[PDB]
């Protein structure tokens, strides 16, 4: 009920709408979430990750010893967007195509928020992501052709610094356009390429620079959602109804030596 | 009964042979009806698509608001042809290779005067189609070679534009063939662009300039058909029988940036 | 759910006695209603009616023969109207006469609106209305006496013209007083006119010029509603409530003889 969904001026119908052109998007933008563990939605009252950790404090009497538990404390974001209160109408009119690109647009830029986090870390929020934080160097795919031995090469260095499991390949919007629109001799390097790396089909993420190589044996990232995403309603005027686009998340790095970053090919 | 089948001087089979012609057309030439959302036949009496926007009314009272609903006419077709009546005899005789030749080319006509709507519009029946309506800037794919890597920029286009989905490729005459007869290399560039889209076979639209990458997420374009294409009677003569091909429909593209337009290759 | 009434700051009582007194003034003026043939409500997404001709598209090939389906959009129409909260809220203290004024405005606004497109037509809307599309030429009706005569006559032109069926005289207010008001040589001339028209009361109607002889055979004129008369909600403040009366009708005129227009008496 944090949403006051209800107190809105919008049909079912409309609402289903809305929802559709939200959840569309986030099935196909959100690379993040198919990717590193993904601990389940806690609710809108879950606030922290329980890290483990201690920290000790000091100026401290001898004869106690005293620790302070360390904590990951959620972010939540929300959105705004502003829809019109006839063009929802439109759709118990009978309409199926209303106007919802305010909708669209701050999807969008939900997905891109969680992303850039999940990937390029969010300083505000005390978030470091996947690419901050790798001790290993970058390599270096010169072109499109070099991505089979440098996959390789992202491999072996995982291999040895421990980390074992299969090893998925994620690429940007630049090198998935390139690696895919790519021959060698006419021979595709995407097929070498998936032939090296997991079954499953290759991950584009659009918030990631260059590409990335990372374990998926599980335990090495993980993506806490408290309130996952959600539509809300906020006020509304005589023509303007104000909605929002609302996540409480936070990601934490646990192996941060589990991912080698490639620069842009 | 608006055919008016049973008083044509036609023998049972020679309907069935008139009929099986054009439906075999039909289904090996209609390239819109399987790649846009389709609604049923809804017979003779239905007279327009219901739209669900409202006009504003000029000049009313203050007192009163004045809206005029919006509706999408649909347009009655029919291409007459004649057959001679001595041929459709001969299927009575045993024959069963009557001269058909008029049937064919009305129903390649008919089909031509639909698919040219679905694509490129119809401006006397107020239908605007789905290249004619993109918002987008046409790509422009210089060698059959190209066709992989431009698809790949239209589906980028359609990803950042909000239209998530599976984005099938339809290739006019020339494209497909091109295509089609296309090595890199002796590499096949077919095979790779297959690859790159949705696994059901590239569609090969006769009536479409260029190619095209259209959403087939469902929702983007709606053909509406009131009568589907049969095939009726009008008169006859001692030697000569009048036969038309008829068929009621509109065209909705409901979403226009879902789909993008190629120049030839 | 188009109404939202739910969302307005009223006392179920309260609605209630706005929709009482909405109710009162649409059965005890909407005399159009009475007279017409009536097409059901259909609902909000009921967008024209199909009146099934067809009209020939110039500028079209020899091969094809196109033409485009003829609909009669229908009109929806808003009139608002505003309350008091206070006034609203005192039902529910028991009170019996809240201020309630607005309301019969609005109605007989409502009423006025769509009885005047009946008789008179509505331009803007599309709309011809009995009187303005009867070809015969209108009787006239010196005085009260001439009443019965001249409503013979019109019979007469009725039979002549082909429309069989019994006839009802529809008065203007004015024509309705005077008539009912009027006795020859003591003698009342409204059971003279009553004892040669149809066994029903006759019917006054407020926007009709004049009086009116139409057939009830049927099938002569016939009025679509799409949304029946309706009360719904559109915005609140601290002490004031807007809300409207709102209708999607049109009005069409199937059998233009089937109606004679007398001038006043």
Redesign the interface.
């Known amino acids: 009920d944090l949403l006051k969904r209800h107190?809105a001026?919008i049909?079912?119908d409309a609402w289903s709408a809305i929802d559709e052109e939200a959840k569309?998007?986030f099935?196909?933008?959100l690379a993040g979430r198919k990717l590193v563990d993904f601990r389940g939605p806690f609710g809108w009252e879950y606030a922290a990750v329980n890290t483990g950790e201690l920290r000790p404090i000091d100026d401290t009497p001898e004869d106690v010893d005293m620790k302070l538990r360390q904590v990951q404390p959620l972010a939540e974001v929300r959105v705004p967007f502003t829809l019109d209160v006839?063009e929802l109408?439109?759709?118990?009119?009978?309409?199926?195509?209303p106007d919802l690109?305010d909708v669209?647009r701050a999807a969008?830029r939900m997905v891109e928020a969680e992303d850039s986090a999940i990937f390029h870390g969010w300083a505000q929020a005390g978030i470091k992501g996947i690419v901050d934080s790798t001790p290993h160097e970058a390599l270096a795919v010169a072109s499109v052709s070099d991505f089979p031995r440098a996959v390789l090469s992202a491999a072996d260095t995982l291999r040895k610094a421990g980390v074992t499991g299969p090893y998925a390949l994620v690429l940007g919007?630049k090198a998935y356009?390139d690696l895919?629109?790519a021959?060698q001799?006419?021979?595709?390097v995407?097929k070498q390429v998936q032939r090296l790396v997991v079954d499953g089909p290759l991950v584009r993420a659009?918030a990631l620079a260059g590409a990335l190589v990372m374990s998926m044996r599980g335990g090495d990232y993980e993506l806490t959602v408290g309130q996952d995403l959600s539509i809300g309603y906020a006020f509304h005027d005589?023509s303007k109804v104000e909605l929002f686009v609302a996540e409480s998340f936070t990601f934490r790095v646990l192996e941060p030596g589990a991912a080698v970053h490639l620069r842009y090919a």
Chains 1, 2, 3 share one sequence.
């Open positions: 107190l001026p049909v079912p569309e998007i099935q196909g933008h006839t109408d439109s759709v118990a009119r009978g309409a199926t195509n690109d669209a969008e919007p356009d895919f629109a021959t001799d006419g021979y595709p995407a659009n005589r």
